Design a protein around this ligand. Sequence first.
Ligand SMILES: [Mg+2]
Length: 482
Amino acid sequence: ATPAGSHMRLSELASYVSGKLIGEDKEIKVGIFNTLGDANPNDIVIRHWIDEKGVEIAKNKEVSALITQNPKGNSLEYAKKLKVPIILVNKIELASAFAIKWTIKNFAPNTYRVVITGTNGKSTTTHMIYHILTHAGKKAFTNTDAKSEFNTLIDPMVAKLLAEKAKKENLEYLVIEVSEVQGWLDRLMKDHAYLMTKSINPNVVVVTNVALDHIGLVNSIEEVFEETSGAVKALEKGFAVLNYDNEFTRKMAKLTNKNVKVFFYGKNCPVTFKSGGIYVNNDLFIKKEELPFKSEYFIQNTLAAISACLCLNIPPDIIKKGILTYKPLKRRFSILCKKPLIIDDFAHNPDGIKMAIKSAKKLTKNKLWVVCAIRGSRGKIINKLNAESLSKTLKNIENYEVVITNSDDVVDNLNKVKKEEEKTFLKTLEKYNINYRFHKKLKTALEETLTNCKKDDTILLIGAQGMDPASKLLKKIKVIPC
Ligand SMILES: [Mg+2]
């Protein structure tokens, strides 16, 4: 069980988190689950690893207990002498999950709760739902904003941030993004989505889609489906909000438990997009020009957010006010310029690349330029599948030009394109008879594209870390602002 109150025994805490207590047992006062850098007296700190310096800082900060998987050097004996309790765990996600459960129970128990997962769209959908609720004046907590995506059990950040806000506000809603496929040291943390959803005990689970990505952690879309479905199996009550247009999210309906209602959104559903607008129960809800220059994914994410909020009994006019004032995250089909139309999108897996190209073509008057940064240091397979998606999506589209780059000039060591990655990407384009130009440097790719393009063309920039710097480079070479 999960205790209520601001005390527990060290031995009880160790058992709660699947750990072993190092040091003498004691009834401790508990503050919140925190990081070492921010810890207040009596806080409990969960950390992947600690060293003797961390033990000393914990003592100075009056931390009640340190929970860790790797006590480096002389940490254990040093902590025993300083009387800093160490709880050794093997599976740190169990400590983070307990920290979330305990924080909810003790600081925000009277809340409605939504979990959002999926391969693409879970951050935007989380952000949209949070925005609808807070724009309506509701008090809510979320673990994702424009700067951060704390969607895992690998650290205590969810428990820390939740506690900090719950002490200051009477929260009514928790809006929690959950990683569907999560790694640790390039190894799959199986059942992460199940465990993290269970720790929230949500009223609503949203699954945006199932798509191939995280090659190396997984390698089949079936496995992505299995791991993602853990969020739905975790749901005890309430509503499963599922994308009807994705085959694998549709299959999750059969996995819902006894007292769970499936709520589908998508084509020929109660919440749907058709003839340029969003409809709810056959009423025109959001109109075409209320969604200017928006992508396929933006629309699907909006359908998901509407659906989740309807399942929370938010009145439709409240939902609409939120949608119309939503401020999107960075590089989500971001319009940087209108003459020429420059679109900046962080597409990075086959589905996202396909979506971005098709959405850009829909808005394209004349020539479509696609500038794509190879996904460096992520493996040959994802780059092959990405080039395959780019090639298959473009092969029937008229009047395009492909510009490929390594972004060697702007990426760090962790994102450098490896020779085998560049090779599989470019050879895939050639297999599909896609003409292309290639530049090692992003700046070269952008300068040449913007020089040769015309004012009625569209320029689509796609890529992850390799394309992140494009906005600043376009300001640098004085393309932006237009
Ligand atoms: Mg998106």
